[PDB]
Write an enzyme that holds these catalytic residues in place. Sequence first.
Site, mmCIF file in Angstrom:
data_model
loop_
_atom_site.group_PDB
_atom_site.id
_atom_site.type_symbol
_atom_site.label_atom_id
_atom_site.label_comp_id
_atom_site.label_asym_id
_atom_site.label_seq_id
_atom_site.Cartn_x
_atom_site.Cartn_y
_atom_site.Cartn_z
ATOM 1 C CG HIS A 12 -0.778 0.404 2.474
ATOM 2 N ND1 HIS A 12 -0.315 -0.328 3.448
ATOM 3 C CD2 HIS A 12 -0.442 1.672 2.916
ATOM 4 C CE1 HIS A 12 -0.100 0.081 4.423
ATOM 5 N NE2 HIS A 12 -0.078 1.664 4.181
ATOM 6 C CG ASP B 138 -0.003 -3.849 2.837
ATOM 7 O OD1 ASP B 138 0.584 -3.397 1.867
ATOM 8 O OD2 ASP B 138 -0.216 -3.003 3.911
ATOM 9 N N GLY C 14 1.427 7.276 8.557
ATOM 10 C CA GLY C 14 2.919 7.595 8.441
ATOM 11 C C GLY C 14 3.746 6.737 8.683
ATOM 12 C CB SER D 189 2.017 2.833 6.253
ATOM 13 O OG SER D 189 0.752 2.636 6.303
ATOM 14 N N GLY D 190 4.455 0.596 6.440
ATOM 15 C CA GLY D 190 5.587 -0.184 5.730
ATOM 16 C C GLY D 190 6.776 0.098 6.569
HETATM 17 C C1 LIG Z 1 -4.895 3.921 11.751
HETATM 18 C C2 LIG Z 1 -3.490 3.750 10.969
HETATM 19 N N1 LIG Z 1 -2.351 3.032 11.191
HETATM 20 C C3 LIG Z 1 -1.558 2.685 10.511
HETATM 21 C C4 LIG Z 1 -1.322 3.611 9.325
HETATM 22 C C5 LIG Z 1 -0.003 3.125 8.346
HETATM 23 O O1 LIG Z 1 -0.303 3.654 7.336
HETATM 24 C C6 LIG Z 1 -2.352 3.946 8.971
HETATM 25 C C7 LIG Z 1 -2.303 4.619 7.420
HETATM 26 O O2 LIG Z 1 -1.929 4.184 6.432
HETATM 27 C C8 LIG Z 1 -3.556 4.318 9.797
HETATM 28 O O3 LIG Z 1 -4.641 4.982 9.026
#
Ligand SMILES: Cc1ncc(CO)c(C=O)c1O
Length: 223
Positions: free
Chosen positions: A40, A84, A175, A177-178
């Site tokens: 993602h 993912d 933020g 994420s990944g």
């Molecule tokens: C709740 C929540 N947790 C983690 C992430 C990591 O992207 C996001 C966004 O991508 C999010 O919205």
Amino acid sequence: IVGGYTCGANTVPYQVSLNSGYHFCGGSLINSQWVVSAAHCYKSGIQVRLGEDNINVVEGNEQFISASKSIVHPSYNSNTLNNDIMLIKLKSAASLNSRVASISLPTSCASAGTQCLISGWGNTKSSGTSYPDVLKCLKAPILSDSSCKSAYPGQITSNMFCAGYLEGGKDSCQGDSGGPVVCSGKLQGIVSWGSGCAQKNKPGVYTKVCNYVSWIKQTIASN
Ligand SMILES: Cc1ncc(CO)c(C=O)c1O
Ligand SMILES: [Ca+2]
Ligand SMILES: [Cl-]
């Protein structure tokens, strides 16, 4: 990261920032030429930023290396976030050192209250918005498969695990994420998704990296 702590400059030397003019996602350095992130997080024009603490200040340990190739997992589903995971090859090899270092892939999956280090430059508030400049850290255990499925009915696959606290207050967030989840020296998770952040009964959900190691090694060996 909500309810975590300042990691300390370069104490997480596998942590990368993915940069398309701004930090948009974390990643994990797995050798001198390869980063693992979330599918993602995919986009064109990625610069990988290694050796980062303050993502807004050049502090002297940074390596900025453009992506030559991105490989989203063959079976990635953007609707369910099943699978993912994506690999990013660097245009040049990172110069590996004490502050820029690869993280070992697991040989086995992690289990229960195995404590893990989650890290990233994501939002630090639950019901507000504040993005930190320096890297934030959270120690969190993996939750039981049964707890994870109970928390998110019809959404948790065999390629996902929950880590964190059902009481809320401590979580990954937008933020992050990944980015990595490292458990006893092994990359066991990738920051994948959540329902808001640090909400009661809504812990972060993570890509189960142990499922993907044969694909990661095969892909790296042929690209
Ligand atoms: C709740 C929540 N947790 C983690 C992430 C990591 O992207 C996001 C966004 O991508 C999010 O919205
Ligand atoms: Ca910096
Ligand atoms: Cl808050």
